[PDB]
């Protein structure tokens, strides 16, 4: 049957949502730390630039992975969190991390 | 600390081992079905060509993901299976598949 083409597309889709080097970092910290403000992510990933960070958060919110919420307190608070889909994505990223550690260990200690 | 750069490299390493459209298919069938002969993979992924399939299996065996074993019976049998690392990689691929299904459902039924 056509079970390969759909397996490929549905695994590829997850890869694109993960994308390049920046999206998975933002998710990782939101998953472990919880809600964070823009400044806080900016400093938890000091390698990231201001312009890149707003672009990645914007794609992630349109991709319904990251939720933005504004609390009109004094002064107002705008904080970022994971959509339920983002949370269901966290185990995968932790699994990939753990496998990378064990495989890098393997490569290193032949 | 430098916890991002190592998280990135160790997640990237897993992505490279997964690589493009062919390596994850071969693993998937070996994980679910078990040991398979070359012909059998060739037919379980009919889209693959002979030349591509031997290249991907060769990278996967050098990457210590796929194990090749020869049984000198009559006539001899050469069969492919997953190294323990390949088996520890299967849950990740099943998780990515399940997340892709639910996220594609989401995209589709807004």
Author numbering:
A (entry chain A), B (entry chain A): 3 to 112
What does the paper say about this structure?
The distance between the DNA-binding helices α4 and α4′ were 34.8 Å in HxlR-WT-FA-DNA and 44.0 Å in HxlR-WT, consistent with the DNA-bound and non-DNA-bound forms of MarR/DUF24 family proteins, respectively. Interestingly, a covalent bridge was clearly visible between the side-chains of Cys11 and Lys13 on the 2Fo-Fc electron density map of the HxlR-WT-FA-DNA structure, while the side-chains of Cys11 and Lys13 were located oppositely in helix α1 and their side-chains were separated 9.6 Å away from each other in the HxlR-WT structure. When the dimeric form of HxlR-WT-FA-DNA and HxlR-WT were superimposed on one monomer, the non-superimposed subunits showed a large conformational change, with the wHTH domain rotated 21.9 degree and tips of the β-wings translocated 24.6 Å. It is noteworthy that although the superimposed subunits of HxlR-WT-FA-DNA and HxlR-WT fit close to each other (r.m.s.d. = 0.595 Å for 82 Cα atoms), an obvious difference was observed on the N-terminal residues. Whereas the N-terminal residues formed an intact helix α1 in the HxlR-WT structure, this helix breaks at Cys11 in HxlR-WT-FA-DNA, with residues before Cys11 becoming unstructured.
